[PDB]
Amino acid sequence: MASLIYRQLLTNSYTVDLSDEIQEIGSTKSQNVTINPGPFAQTGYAPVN
Amino acid sequence: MASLIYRQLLTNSYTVDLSDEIQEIGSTKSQNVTINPGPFAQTGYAPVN
Amino acid sequence: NSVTVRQDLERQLGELREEFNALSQEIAMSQLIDLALLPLDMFSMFSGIKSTIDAAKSMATNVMKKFKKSGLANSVSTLTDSLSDAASSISRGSSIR
Amino acid sequence: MASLIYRQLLTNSYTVDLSDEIQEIGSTKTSLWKEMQYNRDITIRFKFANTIIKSGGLGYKWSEISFKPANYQYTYTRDGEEVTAHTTCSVNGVNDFSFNGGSLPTDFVVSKFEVIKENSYVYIDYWDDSQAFRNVVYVRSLAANLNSVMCTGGSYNFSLPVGQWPVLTGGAVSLHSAGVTLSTQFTDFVSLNSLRFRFRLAVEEPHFKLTRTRLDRLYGLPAADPNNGKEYYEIAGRFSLISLVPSNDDYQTPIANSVTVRQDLERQLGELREEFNALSQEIAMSQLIDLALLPLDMFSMFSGIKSTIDAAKSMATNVMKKFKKSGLANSVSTLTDSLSDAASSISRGSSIRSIGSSASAWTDVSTQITDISSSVSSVSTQTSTISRRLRLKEMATQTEGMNFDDISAAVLKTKIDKSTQISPNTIPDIVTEASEKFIPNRAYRVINNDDVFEAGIDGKFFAYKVDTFEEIPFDVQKFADLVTDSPVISAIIDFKTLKNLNDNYGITKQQAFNLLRSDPRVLREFINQDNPIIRNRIEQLIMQCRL
Amino acid sequence: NSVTVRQDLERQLGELREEFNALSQEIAMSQLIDLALLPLDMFSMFSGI
Amino acid sequence: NLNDNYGITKQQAFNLLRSDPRVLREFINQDNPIIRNRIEQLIMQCRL
């Protein structure tokens, strides 16, 4: 029935995962960002003459 | 109640094979993965003698 | 960039099954049959899952994979092909009763 | 029964898209058959290659360090025999690392630098010489147990005009085999098939560093020296194979090999139809009716196929994607469109039709246009058109009483399981033809408060009473608009057979009620005991389904 | 990188809804009733488009 | 409201079950009763 067809449309969700992993595997590159420090020391070279 | 639950767990055998095939063939044709250098410049005293 | 990750193991299935029965033996009664009338789906059968760590799709696929090798699947397949062959022609005239 | 089989296999035609896209992206750039056991113990030797390219100038900039598919050989001694092997390697899903020294032309820089981590794969193929290696064109299943290898990496150094040379040491990836399949391989125009091995990865503790560079504690085997100056990589393991051979009719003569695939059999269509006519001529008496009750889902439809390729489901649903070329999917699409757009146009679409009893699409849209035959009446034409349309539709939506597609798929299964010569790639046309070419002309019935009539796609039609049997004169419009909004009874037993059966053998009331409403219970109970004339009618009807 | 916008594709539905209303004003009266009776499935709805 | 028109003794046990399209179709096709207004507002009642 139309309402039953609507519930059927709700049921078959086990294909969206297949679809988007298909999208991902044929998609562009992956990447891995790296780590960075915080504050610093503000040093120099005093005894120069 | 359960009738259709066990019906659907049994019918989707036609889809599980598609799933394993597509995951394998995607594993075959995966593209390259490139890391990012990061927001820093790594330098050093190169020409020592 | 560690040495590697290490998947963890799990206890043998016997203790799981016995404690599963021990958990069954304190189920409610009226709400059980109250639930036993609503025919849900294949979807909400696995809607509420714990921590869903990139697992729901793979777990559903694994359920579908493992379900077809059960005794019930073999029994229904032998049912259907046996009746198809029986109706196909006069294949078995009279061997046993 | 089989009505729902056709419905949900048609609805599950949205899955053809994933298969089509993945297949496109993966190629961019009784039995008369017997199986042989094949369990030959195996081991394998590996080898890795590399490619290095510098940039012209002062010899300070380096462009790419990359892997490359290599192929070696070795001489095997197992079971007291000698065999030679050709093997090739490959890799996919490699991570890319880089190191910039700056811009001025006196500093070291490498642009592309591939290293393997826990996201890649390695591919291996065999070339044996035993007869097991020659029977790998038709295989049922494949499995292999292999031992892991604790592979490592070596050390490479550059060379610069001034200063001591930069070195690059270390590399370590463990291997774990998971998955075996089939492929082809060639090196000297010797193209013939082989089997593939895929592996998962794991890296170990050693540090793979670069000297005097702001770089340390790299994890993963690089492409500098993946061999440590060694020769091969010893990996042993079990192996299984259950391939088959196209054996002859006899039993004393097996075959020592298998010749080839893509053989030009492709046997001519039309010569694969008369044997179905014979099979139907020796089909059954009543057990097909027993078969015509259980709804045989997609799993049970192809449970006993016994093939070598699992893509049968995708093609077998592409077929009810592809009735676009026939008149099944086209008919449902067109008539759903007609009902849909007739439900929105009151201005023009609501007045451009013919007349039944009221503005309905199931009756007057049937009388759209058709060139008339030599000599017929009028009412026959409208009855034929409306019966044809509600035939094509009401069958595929819902009804009461046993329906004709049930027996249609019944004869389908009786042919498929008792075929004895069908390839996995000829069913995706037999199913289409049988869904269309069968069921040529069947009549339909509906009950209305002791008043009942019938018509079919032959130009014939009658009307008669329930609790007696005589003809009453026919009318059109009230009958049309009462069949518009009622479940219909697929007339398995037509009017003349009912009249003859009542006249000769008599009938009780309960039998009349449960027979006029297409209940298979009374049908089987009646044809089982003594096979009267309607046994002839049903044998003709199952004879009628020609192709 | 770009300061990603917090809205996407709404500027189409925002104008499409009113013409939905305008066209739905003049639906038929008897034909949509029996348009509901046939169980128009997942394939049928999305085919004739 | 409709009970001013008779429609009784076979239509009550069906239209009260509120599930059969047959009797409502037969009413809507020729009678043009209050139910026509009811379902017309119902159709309008789902604006979006």
Coordinates of C-alpha atoms in Angstrom, one line a residue, chain D:
Chain D
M1 CA 2.4 -16.4 -4.8
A2 CA 4.9 -15.6 -7.6
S3 CA 3.1 -12.2 -8.1
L4 CA 5.1 -11.0 -5.1
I5 CA 8.2 -12.6 -6.4
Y6 CA 8.0 -10.4 -9.5
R7 CA 7.1 -7.4 -7.4
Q8 CA 10.0 -7.4 -5.0
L9 CA 12.5 -8.5 -7.6
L10 CA 11.4 -5.5 -9.7
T11 CA 11.5 -3.1 -6.7
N12 CA 15.0 -4.3 -5.9
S13 CA 16.2 -2.9 -9.2
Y14 CA 17.6 0.3 -7.6
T15 CA 20.7 -1.8 -6.7
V16 CA 21.8 -2.2 -10.3
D17 CA 23.3 1.2 -10.1
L18 CA 26.0 0.4 -7.4
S19 CA 27.0 -2.7 -9.4
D20 CA 27.2 -0.8 -12.6
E21 CA 29.3 2.1 -11.2
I22 CA 31.6 -0.2 -9.4
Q23 CA 32.1 -2.4 -12.5
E24 CA 32.8 0.6 -14.6
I25 CA 35.3 2.1 -12.1
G26 CA 37.0 -1.3 -11.7
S27 CA 37.9 -1.5 -15.4
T28 CA 38.8 2.1 -16.3
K29 CA 42.4 1.6 -17.3
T30 CA 22.1 -35.0 -14.9
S31 CA 24.8 -32.5 -14.0
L32 CA 27.0 -33.3 -17.0
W33 CA 29.8 -31.6 -15.0
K34 CA 32.1 -33.1 -12.4
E35 CA 34.6 -31.6 -10.0
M36 CA 38.1 -32.6 -9.0
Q37 CA 39.8 -32.3 -5.6
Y38 CA 42.9 -30.2 -5.7
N39 CA 44.9 -29.6 -2.5
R40 CA 48.5 -29.0 -3.4
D41 CA 50.8 -27.6 -0.7
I42 CA 52.5 -24.4 -1.8
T43 CA 55.1 -21.8 -0.8
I44 CA 56.1 -18.5 -2.4
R45 CA 59.1 -16.2 -2.9
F46 CA 58.8 -12.5 -3.1
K47 CA 60.8 -9.5 -4.5
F48 CA 60.4 -5.8 -4.4
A49 CA 61.5 -3.1 -6.9
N50 CA 62.0 0.7 -6.8
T51 CA 62.4 3.7 -9.1
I52 CA 64.5 6.8 -8.3
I53 CA 64.7 10.0 -10.5
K54 CA 66.7 13.1 -9.8
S55 CA 66.5 16.6 -11.2
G56 CA 69.0 18.1 -13.5
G57 CA 71.4 20.7 -12.2
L58 CA 73.8 20.6 -9.2
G59 CA 72.6 17.2 -8.0
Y60 CA 70.8 18.6 -4.9
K61 CA 67.1 18.1 -5.7
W62 CA 65.5 14.7 -5.9
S63 CA 62.2 14.2 -7.6
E64 CA 60.5 10.8 -6.9
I65 CA 61.1 7.6 -5.0
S66 CA 58.6 5.0 -6.0
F67 CA 57.8 1.3 -6.0
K68 CA 57.4 -0.6 -9.2
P69 CA 55.9 -4.0 -10.1
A70 CA 58.7 -6.6 -10.4
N71 CA 58.8 -10.2 -11.4
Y72 CA 61.3 -13.0 -10.4
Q73 CA 61.5 -16.8 -10.6
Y74 CA 62.8 -19.8 -8.6
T75 CA 62.9 -23.6 -8.9
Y76 CA 60.7 -25.6 -6.6
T77 CA 61.1 -29.0 -5.1
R78 CA 58.1 -30.5 -3.3
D79 CA 56.6 -34.0 -3.0
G80 CA 59.7 -35.3 -4.8
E81 CA 59.1 -33.3 -8.0
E82 CA 60.5 -30.2 -9.7
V83 CA 58.5 -27.2 -10.8
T84 CA 59.3 -23.6 -11.9
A85 CA 57.4 -20.5 -11.0
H86 CA 56.9 -16.9 -12.2
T87 CA 55.6 -14.4 -9.7
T88 CA 54.9 -10.7 -9.8
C89 CA 54.4 -8.0 -7.1
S90 CA 52.4 -4.8 -6.9
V91 CA 51.1 -2.3 -4.3
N92 CA 48.1 0.0 -4.0
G93 CA 46.9 2.7 -1.5
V94 CA 50.4 4.0 -0.7
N95 CA 50.9 7.0 1.6
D96 CA 52.9 9.9 0.3
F97 CA 55.5 11.8 2.4
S98 CA 57.6 14.7 1.4
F99 CA 60.5 16.8 2.7
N100 CA 61.4 20.3 1.6
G101 CA 64.8 21.8 2.4
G102 CA 64.0 25.2 1.0
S103 CA 64.3 27.1 -2.3
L104 CA 68.0 28.0 -2.8
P105 CA 69.8 25.5 -5.0
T106 CA 72.2 24.3 -2.3
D107 CA 69.8 22.3 0.0
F108 CA 68.5 18.8 -0.1
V109 CA 64.8 18.3 -1.1
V110 CA 62.8 15.2 -2.1
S111 CA 59.3 15.8 -3.5
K112 CA 57.6 12.4 -3.7
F113 CA 58.6 9.7 -1.1
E114 CA 56.2 6.8 -0.7
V115 CA 56.1 4.7 2.5
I116 CA 53.8 1.8 3.3
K117 CA 51.5 2.0 6.4
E118 CA 48.4 0.2 7.7
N119 CA 46.3 1.2 4.7
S120 CA 48.0 -0.5 1.7
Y121 CA 48.0 -3.9 0.1
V122 CA 50.5 -6.2 -1.7
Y123 CA 49.5 -8.5 -4.6
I124 CA 51.1 -11.8 -5.6
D125 CA 50.5 -14.3 -8.4
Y126 CA 51.8 -17.8 -9.2
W127 CA 52.9 -19.7 -12.3
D128 CA 53.0 -23.5 -11.5
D129 CA 53.4 -26.3 -14.0
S130 CA 51.4 -29.2 -12.5
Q131 CA 48.0 -30.1 -13.9
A132 CA 46.4 -28.4 -10.9
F133 CA 47.7 -25.1 -12.4
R134 CA 46.0 -26.0 -15.7
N135 CA 42.5 -26.5 -14.3
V136 CA 42.0 -23.0 -13.0
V137 CA 39.5 -21.7 -15.7
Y138 CA 36.4 -23.1 -14.0
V139 CA 36.6 -23.1 -10.2
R140 CA 33.8 -23.3 -7.6
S141 CA 35.6 -22.0 -4.5
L142 CA 39.1 -21.0 -3.4
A143 CA 40.8 -20.9 -0.1
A144 CA 44.4 -20.8 1.2
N145 CA 46.2 -20.8 4.5
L146 CA 49.5 -18.9 4.6
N147 CA 52.2 -18.1 7.1
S148 CA 53.0 -14.5 8.0
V149 CA 56.4 -13.0 7.1
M150 CA 58.3 -10.6 9.4
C151 CA 59.6 -8.6 6.5
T152 CA 62.0 -5.7 7.0
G153 CA 63.7 -2.8 5.2
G154 CA 67.3 -1.9 4.3
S155 CA 69.3 1.3 3.9
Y156 CA 69.9 3.8 1.1
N157 CA 72.3 6.8 0.8
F158 CA 72.5 9.7 -1.6
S159 CA 75.6 11.5 -2.8
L160 CA 76.4 15.2 -2.8
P161 CA 79.3 17.3 -4.1
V162 CA 80.2 18.6 -0.6
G163 CA 79.8 17.2 2.9
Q164 CA 79.1 13.7 4.0
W165 CA 76.2 11.9 2.3
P166 CA 72.6 11.6 3.6
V167 CA 71.5 8.1 4.6
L168 CA 68.1 6.6 4.9
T169 CA 67.8 3.4 6.9
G170 CA 65.1 1.1 8.2
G171 CA 61.8 -0.3 7.2
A172 CA 59.5 -3.0 8.7
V173 CA 56.0 -4.3 7.7
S174 CA 54.5 -7.6 8.8
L175 CA 52.2 -9.4 6.3
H176 CA 48.9 -11.2 6.8
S177 CA 47.1 -13.0 4.0
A178 CA 43.4 -12.5 3.8
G179 CA 41.7 -13.3 0.4
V180 CA 42.5 -15.2 -2.7
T181 CA 41.2 -14.7 -6.2
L182 CA 42.0 -15.3 -9.9
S183 CA 43.7 -13.2 -12.6
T184 CA 46.0 -13.3 -15.6
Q185 CA 49.7 -12.6 -16.2
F186 CA 52.1 -12.2 -19.1
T187 CA 55.7 -11.4 -19.6
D188 CA 56.7 -12.8 -23.0
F189 CA 53.4 -12.9 -24.9
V190 CA 52.5 -15.9 -22.9
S191 CA 49.2 -14.6 -21.5
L192 CA 47.4 -17.2 -19.4
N193 CA 45.5 -17.0 -16.1
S194 CA 46.8 -17.3 -12.6
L195 CA 45.6 -16.8 -9.0
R196 CA 46.0 -13.7 -6.8
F197 CA 46.9 -13.2 -3.2
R198 CA 46.0 -10.1 -1.1
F199 CA 47.6 -9.2 2.2
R200 CA 47.0 -7.0 5.2
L201 CA 49.8 -5.1 6.9
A202 CA 51.4 -4.3 10.3
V203 CA 54.6 -2.4 11.1
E204 CA 57.1 -3.0 13.9
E205 CA 59.2 -1.1 16.5
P206 CA 62.5 -0.1 14.7
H207 CA 62.9 3.6 13.9
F208 CA 63.4 4.6 10.2
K209 CA 65.1 7.9 10.3
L210 CA 67.0 10.4 8.0
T211 CA 70.3 11.7 9.1
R212 CA 71.1 15.3 9.9
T213 CA 67.5 16.1 9.0
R214 CA 64.6 17.5 11.1
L215 CA 63.0 14.0 10.7
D216 CA 62.9 11.0 13.0
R217 CA 60.7 8.2 14.3
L218 CA 59.2 7.4 11.0
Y219 CA 57.0 4.3 11.1
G220 CA 56.5 2.3 7.9
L221 CA 58.7 0.7 5.3
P222 CA 59.9 3.2 2.7
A223 CA 60.8 2.6 -1.0
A224 CA 64.6 3.0 -0.6
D225 CA 65.8 -0.5 -0.1
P226 CA 63.0 -3.0 0.6
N227 CA 65.3 -6.1 0.3
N228 CA 68.3 -5.6 2.5
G229 CA 70.5 -7.0 -0.3
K230 CA 68.7 -10.4 0.1
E231 CA 67.2 -12.5 -2.7
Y232 CA 63.6 -13.5 -1.9
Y233 CA 61.0 -13.9 0.8
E234 CA 60.1 -17.4 2.0
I235 CA 56.4 -17.8 2.7
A236 CA 54.8 -21.2 2.9
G237 CA 51.2 -22.3 3.5
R238 CA 48.3 -24.6 2.7
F239 CA 46.1 -24.3 -0.4
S240 CA 42.8 -25.7 -1.6
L241 CA 41.0 -25.8 -4.9
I242 CA 37.7 -27.5 -6.0
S243 CA 37.6 -26.7 -9.7
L244 CA 35.6 -28.7 -12.2
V245 CA 35.8 -30.0 -15.8
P246 CA 33.3 -30.2 -18.7
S247 CA 33.2 -34.0 -18.5
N248 CA 31.6 -36.2 -21.1
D249 CA 28.5 -38.3 -20.7
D250 CA 30.5 -41.4 -19.7
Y251 CA 32.2 -42.1 -16.3
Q252 CA 35.3 -44.0 -17.3
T253 CA 36.9 -41.0 -19.1
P254 CA 37.9 -37.9 -17.1
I255 CA 39.9 -35.1 -18.7
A256 CA 43.5 -34.2 -17.7
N257 CA 43.1 -30.5 -18.3
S258 CA 40.7 -27.6 -19.3
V259 CA 41.1 -26.0 -22.6
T260 CA 39.9 -22.4 -22.6
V261 CA 37.1 -19.9 -21.8
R262 CA 35.3 -17.3 -24.1
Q263 CA 34.7 -20.3 -26.3
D264 CA 32.3 -19.5 -29.1
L265 CA 29.4 -21.7 -28.0
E266 CA 26.8 -18.9 -27.4
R267 CA 24.3 -21.3 -28.8
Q268 CA 21.7 -19.9 -31.1
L269 CA 18.5 -18.6 -29.6
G270 CA 15.4 -20.2 -30.8
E271 CA 17.1 -23.6 -30.7
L272 CA 17.0 -23.1 -26.9
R273 CA 13.2 -23.0 -26.9
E274 CA 11.8 -26.3 -28.3
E275 CA 13.4 -28.3 -25.5
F276 CA 11.4 -26.1 -23.0
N277 CA 8.3 -27.1 -25.0
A278 CA 9.2 -30.7 -24.6
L279 CA 9.8 -30.2 -20.8
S280 CA 6.4 -28.6 -20.5
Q281 CA 5.0 -31.6 -22.4
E282 CA 6.3 -33.9 -19.7
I283 CA 5.9 -31.6 -16.7
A284 CA 3.4 -32.7 -14.0
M285 CA -0.1 -33.4 -12.9
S286 CA -0.8 -31.4 -9.7
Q287 CA 2.4 -31.0 -7.7
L288 CA 3.0 -27.7 -9.5
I289 CA -0.1 -26.4 -7.8
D290 CA 1.5 -27.3 -4.5
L291 CA 4.6 -25.4 -5.7
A292 CA 2.3 -22.4 -6.7
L293 CA 1.6 -21.4 -3.1
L294 CA 4.9 -20.8 -1.3
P295 CA 6.4 -17.4 -2.1
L296 CA 9.9 -18.2 -3.3
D297 CA 12.0 -15.2 -2.4
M298 CA 15.2 -14.1 -4.2
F299 CA 17.3 -16.4 -2.1
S300 CA 15.2 -19.5 -2.9
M301 CA 14.9 -18.5 -6.6
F302 CA 18.6 -19.0 -7.1
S303 CA 19.6 -21.3 -4.3
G304 CA 20.4 -24.3 -6.4
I305 CA 22.0 -22.6 -9.4
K306 CA 25.5 -24.1 -8.8
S307 CA 27.5 -21.5 -10.6
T308 CA 31.0 -20.0 -10.4
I309 CA 30.1 -16.3 -10.5
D310 CA 28.0 -14.5 -7.9
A311 CA 26.9 -11.6 -10.2
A312 CA 23.8 -13.5 -11.1
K313 CA 21.6 -11.4 -8.8
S314 CA 22.8 -8.1 -10.3
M315 CA 22.0 -9.3 -13.9
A316 CA 18.7 -11.0 -12.8
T317 CA 17.5 -7.7 -11.4
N318 CA 18.9 -5.8 -14.4
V319 CA 16.4 -7.8 -16.4
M320 CA 13.4 -6.1 -14.7
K321 CA 15.4 -2.9 -15.0
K322 CA 15.7 -3.7 -18.7
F323 CA 12.1 -4.6 -19.7
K324 CA 12.3 -1.0 -20.8
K325 CA 13.1 -2.9 -24.0
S326 CA 9.9 -5.1 -23.6
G327 CA 6.3 -4.2 -22.6
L328 CA 6.3 -5.0 -18.8
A329 CA 8.3 -2.2 -17.2
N330 CA 7.2 0.2 -20.0
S331 CA 3.6 -0.7 -19.4
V332 CA 3.7 -0.1 -15.6
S333 CA 5.7 3.1 -16.1
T334 CA 3.2 4.4 -18.7
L335 CA 0.1 3.6 -16.8
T336 CA 1.4 4.9 -13.5
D337 CA 2.2 8.1 -15.4
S338 CA -1.4 8.2 -16.9
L339 CA -3.0 7.7 -13.5
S340 CA -0.7 10.3 -11.9
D341 CA -1.2 13.1 -14.5
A342 CA -4.9 12.3 -14.8
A343 CA -5.2 13.1 -11.1
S344 CA -4.1 16.7 -11.6
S345 CA -5.5 18.0 -14.9
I346 CA -9.1 19.1 -14.6
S347 CA -8.7 21.8 -17.3
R348 CA -7.9 19.6 -20.3
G349 CA -6.9 16.1 -19.4
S350 CA -10.2 15.4 -17.6
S351 CA -12.2 15.8 -20.8
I352 CA -10.0 14.4 -23.7
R353 CA -10.9 10.7 -22.9
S354 CA -13.6 8.4 -24.1
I355 CA -16.7 7.5 -22.1
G356 CA -17.4 4.6 -19.8
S357 CA -19.7 5.4 -16.9
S358 CA -17.6 8.2 -15.3
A359 CA -14.2 9.9 -15.6
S360 CA -11.9 7.0 -14.8
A361 CA -8.5 6.1 -16.2
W362 CA -8.8 2.4 -15.8
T363 CA -11.6 2.1 -18.3
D364 CA -11.6 4.9 -20.9
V365 CA -7.9 5.4 -21.2
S366 CA -7.9 1.7 -22.3
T367 CA -10.0 2.8 -25.3
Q368 CA -7.3 5.2 -26.6
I369 CA -6.6 4.0 -30.2
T370 CA -6.1 0.8 -32.0
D371 CA -6.6 -0.1 -35.7
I372 CA -9.5 -2.5 -35.9
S373 CA -9.5 -6.1 -37.4
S374 CA -11.4 -7.5 -40.3
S375 CA -14.8 -8.3 -38.9
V376 CA -15.6 -7.9 -35.2
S377 CA -18.3 -6.2 -33.1
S378 CA -17.9 -3.1 -30.9
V379 CA -18.1 -4.2 -27.3
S380 CA -15.5 -6.9 -27.9
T381 CA -13.0 -4.1 -28.5
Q382 CA -13.6 -2.1 -25.3
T383 CA -13.8 -5.3 -23.3
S384 CA -10.5 -6.6 -24.7
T385 CA -8.7 -3.3 -24.1
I386 CA -9.9 -2.9 -20.5
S387 CA -9.2 -6.6 -19.7
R388 CA -5.7 -6.3 -21.1
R389 CA -4.9 -3.2 -19.1
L390 CA -6.3 -4.5 -15.8
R391 CA -4.5 -7.8 -16.6
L392 CA -1.2 -6.1 -16.9
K393 CA -1.8 -4.1 -13.7
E394 CA -4.1 -5.7 -11.1
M395 CA -1.8 -8.8 -11.3
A396 CA 1.2 -6.8 -10.1
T397 CA -0.5 -4.9 -7.3
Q398 CA -2.8 -7.2 -5.3
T399 CA -5.8 -9.6 -5.7
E400 CA -7.7 -12.5 -4.1
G401 CA -7.6 -16.1 -5.3
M402 CA -4.7 -17.9 -6.9
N403 CA -3.2 -15.9 -9.8
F404 CA -1.6 -16.8 -13.1
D405 CA 1.9 -15.6 -12.4
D406 CA 2.1 -18.2 -9.7
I407 CA 1.8 -21.0 -12.2
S408 CA 4.0 -19.0 -14.5
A409 CA 6.9 -19.0 -12.1
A410 CA 6.0 -22.6 -11.3
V411 CA 6.7 -23.7 -14.8
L412 CA 9.8 -21.4 -14.7
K413 CA 11.2 -23.3 -11.8
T414 CA 10.3 -26.7 -13.2
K415 CA 12.2 -25.7 -16.4
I416 CA 15.2 -24.2 -14.5
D417 CA 15.8 -27.1 -12.1
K418 CA 15.2 -29.6 -15.0
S419 CA 17.0 -27.8 -17.7
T420 CA 20.2 -29.8 -18.1
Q421 CA 21.8 -27.3 -20.5
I422 CA 21.7 -23.6 -19.3
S423 CA 24.6 -21.3 -18.7
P424 CA 24.5 -18.6 -15.9
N425 CA 24.4 -16.0 -18.7
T426 CA 21.3 -17.2 -20.6
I427 CA 18.8 -17.0 -17.8
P428 CA 18.7 -13.2 -18.0
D429 CA 16.8 -13.5 -21.2
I430 CA 14.7 -16.6 -20.5
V431 CA 13.3 -15.0 -17.4
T432 CA 12.3 -11.9 -19.4
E433 CA 10.7 -13.9 -22.3
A434 CA 8.9 -16.2 -19.9
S435 CA 7.6 -13.2 -17.9
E436 CA 6.3 -11.7 -21.2
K437 CA 5.8 -14.5 -23.7
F438 CA 3.8 -16.8 -21.4
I439 CA 0.2 -16.1 -20.4
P440 CA -1.1 -15.1 -23.9
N441 CA -4.8 -14.7 -23.2
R442 CA -6.7 -15.2 -19.9
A443 CA -10.2 -14.1 -18.7
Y444 CA -11.1 -12.4 -15.5
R445 CA -14.1 -12.4 -13.2
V446 CA -15.6 -10.3 -10.4
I447 CA -18.5 -11.0 -8.0
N448 CA -21.3 -8.5 -7.3
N449 CA -24.2 -9.5 -4.9
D450 CA -25.2 -12.7 -6.8
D451 CA -24.4 -11.1 -10.2
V452 CA -21.2 -12.2 -11.8
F453 CA -19.7 -11.7 -15.3
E454 CA -16.4 -12.3 -17.1
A455 CA -14.3 -11.2 -20.0
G456 CA -10.8 -11.8 -21.4
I457 CA -8.3 -10.6 -24.0
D458 CA -9.8 -12.7 -26.9
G459 CA -12.8 -10.5 -27.6
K460 CA -15.1 -12.9 -25.6
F461 CA -17.3 -12.1 -22.7
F462 CA -20.4 -13.5 -20.9
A463 CA -22.5 -12.9 -17.8
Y464 CA -24.3 -15.3 -15.6
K465 CA -25.9 -15.9 -12.2
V466 CA -24.3 -17.3 -9.1
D467 CA -26.8 -19.9 -7.7
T468 CA -27.6 -21.1 -11.3
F469 CA -25.9 -20.9 -14.7
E470 CA -27.5 -19.2 -17.6
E471 CA -26.4 -16.2 -19.8
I472 CA -27.9 -12.8 -19.3
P473 CA -27.4 -10.0 -21.8
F474 CA -24.2 -7.9 -21.4
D475 CA -23.8 -4.3 -20.5
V476 CA -20.6 -2.2 -20.3
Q477 CA -20.5 1.0 -18.2
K478 CA -21.7 -0.3 -14.8
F479 CA -19.6 -3.4 -15.2
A480 CA -16.5 -1.3 -16.1
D481 CA -16.9 1.1 -13.2
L482 CA -17.5 -1.8 -10.8
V483 CA -14.3 -3.6 -11.9
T484 CA -12.5 -0.2 -11.6
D485 CA -12.6 -0.2 -7.8
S486 CA -12.9 -3.9 -6.8
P487 CA -10.4 -6.8 -6.4
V488 CA -10.7 -9.0 -9.4
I489 CA -10.8 -12.8 -9.6
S490 CA -8.3 -14.2 -12.2
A491 CA -10.5 -16.7 -14.0
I492 CA -8.4 -19.8 -13.9
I493 CA -11.5 -21.8 -14.9
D494 CA -13.4 -20.2 -17.7
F495 CA -17.2 -20.2 -18.2
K496 CA -17.6 -23.0 -20.7
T497 CA -15.7 -25.5 -18.5
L498 CA -17.8 -24.5 -15.5
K499 CA -21.0 -25.1 -17.5
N500 CA -19.8 -28.4 -18.8
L501 CA -18.6 -29.6 -15.3
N502 CA -21.9 -28.6 -13.7
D503 CA -23.9 -30.3 -16.5
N504 CA -22.0 -33.6 -16.4
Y505 CA -20.7 -34.4 -12.9
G506 CA -22.8 -32.0 -10.8
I507 CA -21.6 -29.7 -8.0
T508 CA -22.6 -28.7 -4.5
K509 CA -22.9 -25.1 -3.3
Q510 CA -19.7 -24.9 -1.2
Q511 CA -17.7 -26.2 -4.2
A512 CA -19.4 -23.6 -6.4
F513 CA -18.5 -20.7 -4.0
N514 CA -14.9 -21.8 -3.4
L515 CA -14.3 -22.6 -7.1
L516 CA -15.7 -19.3 -8.5
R517 CA -13.3 -17.4 -6.2
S518 CA -10.1 -19.1 -7.4
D519 CA -9.4 -21.1 -4.2
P520 CA -6.6 -23.6 -4.9
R521 CA -7.9 -25.8 -2.1
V522 CA -10.9 -27.1 -4.0
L523 CA -9.0 -27.0 -7.3
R524 CA -6.3 -29.5 -6.1
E525 CA -8.8 -31.5 -4.1
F526 CA -10.9 -31.9 -7.2
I527 CA -8.2 -32.6 -9.8
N528 CA -6.4 -35.0 -7.5
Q529 CA -9.1 -37.6 -7.0
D530 CA -10.3 -38.6 -10.5
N531 CA -9.0 -35.9 -13.1
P532 CA -12.2 -34.7 -14.9
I533 CA -12.4 -32.4 -17.9
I534 CA -10.9 -29.5 -16.1
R535 CA -7.8 -31.6 -15.6
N536 CA -7.7 -31.4 -19.4
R537 CA -8.4 -27.6 -19.2
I538 CA -5.5 -27.1 -16.8
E539 CA -3.2 -29.4 -18.8
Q540 CA -4.0 -27.3 -21.9
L541 CA -3.4 -24.1 -19.9
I542 CA 0.0 -25.3 -18.7
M543 CA 0.6 -26.5 -22.3
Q544 CA -0.4 -22.9 -23.4
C545 CA 2.7 -21.3 -21.8
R546 CA 4.9 -21.8 -24.8
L547 CA 7.9 -19.5 -24.4

